Amino acid sequence: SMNPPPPETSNPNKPKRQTNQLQYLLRVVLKTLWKHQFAWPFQQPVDAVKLNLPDYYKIIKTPMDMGTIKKRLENNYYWNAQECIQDFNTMFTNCYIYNKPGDDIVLMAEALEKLFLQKINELPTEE
Numbered sequence: 861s862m863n864p865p866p867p868e869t870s871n872p873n874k875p876k877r878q879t880n881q882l883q884y885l886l887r888v889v890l891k892t893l894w895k896h897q898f899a900w901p902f903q904q905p906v907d908a909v910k911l912n913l914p915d916y917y918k919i920i921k922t923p924m925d926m927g928t929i930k931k932r933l934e935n936n937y938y939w940n941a942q943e944c945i946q947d948f949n950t951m952f953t954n955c956y957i958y959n960k961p962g963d964d965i966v967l968m969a970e971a972l973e974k975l976f977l978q979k980i981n982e983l984p985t986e987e
C-alpha cells in the first residue's frame with residue numbers, strides 16, 4: 861500500500877512565532893540528536909513500502925520523525941516549544957508502540973530519548 865503524505869511542514873493558516881525556546885530546540889536539541897550514531901532511522905518518515913511493513917500505518921496513525929521536526933523548526937511552523945516537544949514525544953512513543961521491548965530500533969530510540977530528556981531539562985525560560 862502507498863505511504864501517506866508526510867506530516868505538513870508549511871501551512872499559512874497555522875499561526876507561528878519565534879521563541880528562544882524554539883531556537884534552543886533547533887540549535888541544541890535537534891542538532892545534538894541528529895548527529896547521534898543512532899539517528900538515521902528517525903531522520904525521515906517511515907517508508908513502509910521500502911521497509912515492507914504493510915501494517916505500519918494501520919498501527920501508527922500519528923506518524924512523526926526528526927526530518928519533519930527539522931523542517932518545522934527551520935520553516936517556523938510552530939507557535940510554542942510544547943508543539944515541538946510533543947512531536948518528539950510522538951516519534952518516540954510510536955517506535956515503542958510499533959516495535960517490541962529490546963528490539964534494536966527501540967534501544968536506538970531510547971538512546972535518543974535519554975539525550976532528549978537531558979537537553980529538555982535544560983530548556984531556557986521563555987524570554
Ligand SMILES: Cc1noc(C)c1-c1cc(O)cc([C@@H](O)c2ccccc2)c1
Nearest residue numbers: 900901902906911954955958959964965
Ligand atoms: C523509526 C522506526 N519505528 O518503527 C520502525 C519500523 C522504524 C524504522 C525506521 C527505519 O528507517 C528503519 C528501520 C529498520 O530498518 C531498522 C531496524 C533496526 C535498526 C535500525 C533500523 C525501522
